[PDB]
Design a protein around this ligand. Structure first.
Ligand SMILES: O=C1Cc2cc(Nc3cc(Cl)ncc3Cl)ccc2N1
Ligand SMILES: O=C1Cc2cc(Nc3cc(Cl)ncc3Cl)ccc2N1
Ligand SMILES: [Cl-]
Ligand SMILES: [Cl-]
Lengths: 4, 122, 122, 4
């Protein structure tokens, strides 16, 4: 999971 | 402020390909000369300008069988259908002309672009 | 010896989401309390262990309406349906419990994992 | 396009  | 799962789109496409290999929820047959290819209308539309136009048509959206132009090569179509469901293109010296022609007909602009680049190099 | 188009899976999912927003080729309604959500069976199956089981069932595969357990919160479902079609999860302090519970019921293991991690941190 |  990432910060888009 | 959403978070994103990097592998989600790839995993979705992988599962759609698994449904295709097992013939699950396929709703159309694409006829190319004597050859028949089962697929999901939504995936075809998401990948091809031609299928997008066909399946948004109020009459054609309801067809279970679609016949392609007789000039379309079944192998070129098979390579492109595999690309639609995997992101992988089996581009070879012996098939590049048939793949480019089929991609132009199917309106798959990114495949057309790489075929034009690979042809120019040789 | 294939070549790969990096953005293909993301572009396919983006087009499937565009078909969903325009209600094109949607083939099922998911009922959550009073709320109704239109979707594509294939996308639901590709994202959820629960929908995968439902739509591979010889009887349920043919249903146009699926009713979820009354304990399922419509907002939690809406956030998860958006994630299915975009890879983006709108996870917030006020919805995390409902999102985790809905993801456990839908069998969306990667969402369950991030919810458990975010809850543990607080 | 890449070599996967
Ligand atoms: O090279 C290409 C690939 C492609 C895909 C689609 N399919 C869609 C496009 C839009 Cl805007 N919304 C929904 C869909 Cl399914 C249309 C044209 C082309 N050309
Ligand atoms: O967390 C999850 C997400 C998920 C998706 C699917 N869907 C499939 C799985 C296979 Cl192997 N082939 C085809 C499909 Cl559509 C099943 C279980 C789970 N669990
Ligand atoms: Cl393309
Ligand atoms: Cl997940």
């Amino acid at each position: 999971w990432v910060i888009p | 402020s959403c978070i994103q799962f990097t592998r989600h789109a790839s995993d979705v496409l992988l599962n759609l390909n698994r449904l295709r290999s097992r013939d699950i929820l396929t709703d159309v047959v694409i006829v190319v000369s004597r050859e028949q290819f089962r697929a999901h209308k939504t995936v075809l539309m998401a990948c091809s300008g031609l299928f997008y136009s066909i399946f948004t048509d109020q009459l054609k959206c309801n067809l279970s069988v679609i016949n392609l132009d007789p000039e379309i090569n079944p192998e070129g179509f098979c390579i492109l259908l595999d690309f639609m469901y995997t992101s992988r293109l089996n581009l070879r010296e012996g098939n590049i002309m048939a793949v480019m022609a089929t991609a132009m007909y199917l309106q798959m602009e990114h495949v057309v672009d790489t075929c034009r680049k690979f042809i120019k190099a040789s």
